[PDB]
Design a protein around this ligand. Structure first.
Ligand SMILES: [Co+2]
Ligand SMILES: [Co+2]
Lengths: 202, 202
């Protein structure tokens, strides 16, 4: 069986309280993430050789996939990849920026504080469903960008370092309309060690 | 003062229970709808003569508004118009299709049941944030279409007859990921008399 799978949450469903509620973690992982994976697998039944592509490979070749599944793969491989990434980039452990990622943030944004301000503003300004990302070019230059729906920076040859889901399902149960509060709180759970590995994998 | 205003909810905040929760009605009207109106008014301070356009006029002329506010007006006039419309198209009273709208539904969809099935499927299939609409051409021909985010059929010279908000904020508190259940329940509160007036105003 080479079908795509949902990665088990890397910590307890209540591990991110009080910043993200357990009920949301259950729904987000067990229902939303699970649905993207199921829908992707269903779409590929017609072209089973595609089960041997990685999620990244699907995302890097959306415009050359068979026409009849291009959109479904974009949405659902996007959803599968972004959510796997998202749960991996959070942690109950305390972490801070370090080594080359820490230096790069200072270099490219001036300071951690300026980076944080810009990231929070970009996340807040996403209109409709989408994501805010810290991304790196292949040479390690950092910037902040957003994507709509389940579109991914991977499709633009940019490497996600950290990323925040600002679909309303990610925050409504606890924060309702107050996305600003969600964004501010989320920084308490960003896994900076994971982000560092993401940066080093360039 | 010719600034755009939030229309007071046309019934009690708990009037749509048990199909839509009071807490959602409060948030949806008092926070989300209110925000679109505030943001629109702010954007027009620079061009106060635009306060004399109707929401429809703004929406019909997005591509000819001053470049610096075109997008903000699209999103926020869209939000203001769609939500005013949405709260107006629901009711605690019992209503059914009648007169010319009833006939037109049968003519254009074959039966009310077929219309309902198609509408529900279109609403379910909206990916990301958006709306499902029953719309009429200027000659009264009916069809179902969806729009993303706060885009509106009005911008395409189509007249909304009924419309369903499928942004997650519209249903997450009560239905969480189960948009299908939200959509099915919503039909209990559709104001068919209001829809009829919408249809007759062609
Ligand atoms: Co999500
Ligand atoms: Co809404």
């Amino acid at each position: 069986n080479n079908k795509f799978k949902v990665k088990p949450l890397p910590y307890a469903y209540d591990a991110l309280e009080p910043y993200i509620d357990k009920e949301t973690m259950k729904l987000h992982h067990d229902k939303h993430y699970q649905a993207y994976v199921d829908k992707l697998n269903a779409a590929l039944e017609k072209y089973p050789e595609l089960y041997n592509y990685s999620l990244c490979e699907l995302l890097q070749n959306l415009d050359s996939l068979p026409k009849d599944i291009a959109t479904t793969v974009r949405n659902n491989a996007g959803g599968a990849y972004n959510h796997k990434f998202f749960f991996d980039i959070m942690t109950p452990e305390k972490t801070i920026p370090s080594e080359s990622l820490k230096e790069a943030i200072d270099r490219d944004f001036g300071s951690f504080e300026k980076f944080k301000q810009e990231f929070q503003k970009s996340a807040l300004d996403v209109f409709g469903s989408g994501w805010a990302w810290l991304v790196a070019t292949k040479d390690g230059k950092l910037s902040i960008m957003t994507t709509p729906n389940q579109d991914s920076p991977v499709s633009k040859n940019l490497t996600p370092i950290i990323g925040l889901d600002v679909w309303e399902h990610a925050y409504y149960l606890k924060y309702q309309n107050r996305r600003n509060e969600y964004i501010d709180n989320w920084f308490n759970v960003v896994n900076w060690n994971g982000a560092l590995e993401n940066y080093k994998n360039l």
